[PDB]
Amino acid sequence: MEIDELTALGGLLHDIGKPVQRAGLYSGDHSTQGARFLRDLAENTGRAEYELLSLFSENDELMIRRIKELSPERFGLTMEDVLNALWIVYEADNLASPQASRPLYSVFNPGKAYPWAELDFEKELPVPGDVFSIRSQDYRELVKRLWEELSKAKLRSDRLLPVLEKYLTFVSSVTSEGNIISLYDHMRMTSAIALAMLRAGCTAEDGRCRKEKRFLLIEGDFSGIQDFIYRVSTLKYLRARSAYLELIGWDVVLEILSRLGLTRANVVFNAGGHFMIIAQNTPDAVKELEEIRAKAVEWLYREFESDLYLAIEWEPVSGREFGREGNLFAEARKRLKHKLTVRKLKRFGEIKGLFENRLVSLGGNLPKLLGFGRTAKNDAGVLVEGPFSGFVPYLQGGRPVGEQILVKNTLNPGEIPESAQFVPYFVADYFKKDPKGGVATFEELSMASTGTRRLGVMKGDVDRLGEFFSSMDSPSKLATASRFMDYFFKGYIGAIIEGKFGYIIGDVPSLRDWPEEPDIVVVYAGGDDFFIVGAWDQIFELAFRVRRAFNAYTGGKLTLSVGLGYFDERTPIYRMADVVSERLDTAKDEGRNRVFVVGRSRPLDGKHKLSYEWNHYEELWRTYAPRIYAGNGRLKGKLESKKGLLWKLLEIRELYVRDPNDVRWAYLTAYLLGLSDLFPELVGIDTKAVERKEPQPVYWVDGVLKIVLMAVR
């Protein structure tokens, strides 16, 4: 052992006493009961170092003797070392931050809470709901799976996090009411803030490493992400660009971790081209961070010109500012945000030389691999390179190559060598496969569409998400919001598309029966910002599926805004992407919590919005679609041979667009269908809407009619 790896595992297990107290195995306080769990475990399999980490649950008289009892020489550590390791890991538990049955209260809605289940994207969608007292039986079956895994885990931080995350994710760090923090997040945030103080040199302080600025909040944001993925010259290439921006991200994050002697626990989040890192305030660190920033900007300039940038700013920070007084955390993130917005306005300022087929094989080989190896640049089978290291693809049969192995879409290290740092990454990579093993193309997606052969393109966004993240008091709160947020897109969107959570979602606007292998292709999902393409009607339905599940998955306390477009299969990507992007921030602009559903004529009186409130559109599809649309591309038998009506209504509605105060439209509709009993809601003058200065029901019909007509051609 070294003092570095010991303190990391220290902070990481300080509070593994909590899952065993509530199971009732060793009937002491969690401090005591967590020590008997590890010392117990050490004895079994006979791994001496667990008995050394057992001290972290517990006038220092007995402690120095209980450490002296244990051979610090047997490992490579001093006694006066392990005393700092304990006080550091003690203080960090303060910095990170009742009944033995209270469940985890959802960060989205602290009024709801998660049913005790373990993290599995395949099985079910976590929905904050009704508080169920957690049995001591359940904790005992958890602790037994926890026991068996830590038995086989290789006692590096990299193998330990994946089992702590698997099991202790849906568990209240503290069992008071309205407690937001997941156990695993509070564990990793201490394992981070502890390791930070160690490298910061400071020791035997009991408030030097608390009121002195011995921390760095690091934040890297990519700018030009869309300019780099879109704006090309095909679909295979476009996902290939998304994937590749993921690897460049890790390669800079992993380098910063490597070169500061930190661990993956120090990565607060890393998704949507945004990463945050907690680290030391030593002069060596700031030197190393400028070196990494500098070398990484240049590599980005030579390979992509100014197309894609990386703004890495950091702020020095005291322990105080890791939580609440008088909010200091969200205040200090706010001064880092500022530093970033200036740097993004100084693109490649870090380059004074400024003012004077692999990705084709990364789109074709895509459906057989488990991850990538992070070796040197000059290495055999290196498929693509980042700003620091070469990435060799890792095939099912293949042998993992490199210092770090990025594994995709498992927390289970599987068959890789003991000496390989394990870095799990998830990504919403759903795609329709063709009769050829390759992913579906824009014509293939456009051809499986009900009625008119157009390609659906949908672009989404989580509403006021920067506000939400800025509301978190503590790193452990922020860790949980970010982790759960990212997991909805990277974990659950894969499922929603397959058809899972049919109950929780329910009735949504749809034109065909959901397919078993949906004609959808995720381009880039992940935290907040997603972009999906496929058969236009499947993309139209997916839009509401994603919005419902997201409403469920959250407290119904967070909203989407989605921009939808249906284009000709032979449309250039940047143009399609340019349009929905425009339709999307129309949705955000007309208040939020809305979907832009189709192109729409409207009076420009500043009173008529193009987007729909989601429930408003959902209520409209319920009312009108069943009266005119038979399902699966056919029209209601009654209108079959009276279809011309639906155009004559659209024609009628247009005479309302011309003058919204003229009543003539209600004259006309009554003659037009005089069967009469269809569309009662539009023949009359709504005086409620005249009061509320809202539009007339006629103004909204197009958003349902035009879709039906698209599906019946």
Binding site: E305, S306, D307, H338, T341, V342, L345, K346, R347, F348, G349, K352, L354, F355, R464, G466, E467, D568, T571, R575, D585, D589
Partner: protein, 242 residues
Amino acid sequence: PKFIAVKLIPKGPFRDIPRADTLFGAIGNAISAIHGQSAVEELVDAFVGGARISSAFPYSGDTYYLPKPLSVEPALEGDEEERYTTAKRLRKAKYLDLKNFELALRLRPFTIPEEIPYARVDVPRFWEEIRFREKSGVYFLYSGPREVFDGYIAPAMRFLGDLFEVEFHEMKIDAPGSEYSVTLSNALPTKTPVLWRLLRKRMTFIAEGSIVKNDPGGMERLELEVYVYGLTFPLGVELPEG
């Protein structure tokens, strides 16, 4: 300062909004066609020697728009759910009217134009045009000696006219005195600027609205002898502390 604004009343729909590097490029080609090199060398020397043209910007009736100076972006915070939304729509805003532009220079409170008089239709067969609202065209500014406007620019603009027509007027912009300035042309900088957005064309320009400390810009001559306009159109701007 006070400027002569060459208004391009559009007899038909445009293909682009022409920034200063291509306005100058067309003015040069027109002078080459009418007069030839002898004048182009004196057209360059007039610019090197002090004269400037801004990029092209939208107008609407008696409303002239200008590029939002990037100096306002870091100073925005200078309600919770009212600060988020508007502050993003200010960060998104590309153009301001002259009133709000003159306020933006002095980091005073200012509002955004709700309606923009041009619209990027992309017609399929595909390319795109720009459809101008009524009495709505594009202008660009010219600072420098009168003898050189009557001489070189006005005849070149008239000659270029013969897709649009050309009228022009005086035009004042109240800009505070400052060490820092906003370019109203895309520029090729000589110092490293203050705040900026890069612009790729092959040359890296600094965008209309970037911030400079006494950077004249500069022109570049090359053989394919054609000159490329990268001069600054500087207007006094106030900065926050940052």
